[PDB]
């Protein structure tokens, strides 16, 4: 019965990723005065299936100079980690109920960077290497401030349990209490998912295909699926953390509908942002995250430690 739950989680997520590819193409097309996919299937509804079937029937290449073991391990790690980061999300009930869900997401996301690191190194080509060192720099840029923002926001939750976030925001969204932290968190999640304007690792104009330039076919497809699953997962985490849906214990379907709508809106905002802006230089991302975000985050952390004590508004569950 638990395996049925695992499958009912992981298969719909892959289908959502497949159709998010089409939705992104159509949103970008219509923001660019064109249409996007509308031929293969009514309204391009069969385009993701054609893409997947073309990729998995295409020859996979193992580079002559590459390390083969790491070259094959990296996409497996990427996809499995992207699938695993979904299990503690309460929708309104989680698949795996943890005391410290937030720390689990933190650790698994910080493990996910080694997929890019090891694929870029194991390709044994120059553009892949440049992509990998850009990944190193990006993680160094965003990690500390991301963690401090999470701590500051959760100081009103009372714990690290994700389900407590539903009862914390029973009356008001957490975005009305910490909107500067919400802004910094949104930019941090854009940087954490290698999304425009922070899509430095791929670096398409600058680095051809970057870290995954050597990759082709099915192995290449796995990287794409992992990235888009990460997009959806991070936006769902943001929706749970800042726009809290109201949960009726006798009707969880209403909560599920509302939460799915909110995360879809955040994902569409990601696509909008990609369509609207140019790319950062990767030293400029580090300067932004270390000279503007970090001091404000430290000050707001001090403020959010002090405020519940001053106002006698400390949450329960020591």
């Amino acid at each position: 019965m638990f395996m049925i739950n695992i499958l009912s989680l992981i298969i719909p997520i892959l289908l959502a990723v497949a159709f998010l590819t089409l939705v992104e193409r159509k949103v970008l097309g219509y923001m660019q005065l064109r249409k996007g996919p509308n031929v293969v299937g009514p309204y391009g509804l069969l385009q993701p299936i054609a893409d997947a079937l073309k990729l998995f029937t295409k020859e996979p290449l193992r580079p002559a100079t590459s390390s083969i073991s790491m070259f094959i391990i990296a996409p497996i790690l990427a996809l499995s980690l992207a699938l695993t980061m979904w299990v503690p999300l309460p929708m309104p009930y989680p698949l795996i109920n943890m005391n410290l869900g937030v720390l689990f997401m933190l650790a698994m996301s910080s493990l996910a960077v080694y997929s890019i690191l090891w694929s870029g190194w194991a390709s044994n080509s120059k553009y892949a290497l440049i992509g990998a060192l850009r990944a190193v720099a990006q993680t160094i840029s965003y990690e500390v401030t991301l963690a401090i923002i999470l701590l500051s926001v959760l100081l009103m939750n009372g714990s690290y349990t994700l389900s407590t976030l539903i009862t914390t925001q029973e009356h008001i969204w957490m975005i009305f209490t910490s909107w500067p932290l919400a802004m910094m968190w949104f930019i941090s999640t854009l940087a954490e998912t290698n999304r425009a304007p922070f899509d430095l690792t791929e670096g398409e104009s600058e680095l051809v295909s970057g870290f995954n330039v050597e990759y082709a076919a099915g192995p290449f497809a796995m990287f794409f699926m992992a990235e888009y699953a990460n997009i959806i997962m991070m936006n769902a985490f943001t929706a749970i953390l800042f726009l809290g849906a109201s949960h009726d214990p006798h009707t969880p379907e209403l909560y599920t509908i509302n939460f799915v709508l909110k995360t879809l809106a955040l994902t569409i905002t990601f696509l909008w942002i990609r369509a609207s802006y140019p790319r950062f230089r990767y030293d400029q991302l580090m300067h932004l995250l270390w000279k503007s975000f970090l001091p404000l985050t430290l000050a707001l952390c001090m403020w959010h430690i002090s405020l519940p004590i001053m106002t006698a508004s400390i949450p329960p569950q020591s």
């Binding site: 009372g158 009356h171 009305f176 209490t177 909107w179 329960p316």
Partner: protein
């Protein structure tokens, strides 16, 4: 032997064509936006204060039930 017919501009002249930059101001002042943000923050703080105190009372009640059941 009719009149010469050639592509030409119309009698009098064509309408004037705009070319200068046009970027309207289209925004509120900084004071208004800062005030709205601070007001939202204060409203959220006060609502959170009420809710957290209620939650503390509920936790005390549940702990008392556990204390009653312990022996």
């Amino acid at each position: 032997a009719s009149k010469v017919k050639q592509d030409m501009p119309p009698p009098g002249g064509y309408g004037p064509i705009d070319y200068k930059r046009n970027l309207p101001r289209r925004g509120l002042s900084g004071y208004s936006m800062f005030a709205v943000g601070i007001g939202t923050l204060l409203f959220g703080y006060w609502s959170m204060m009420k809710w957290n105190r209620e939650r503390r009372r509920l936790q005390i009640e549940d702990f008392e039930a556990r204390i009653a059941l312990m022996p």
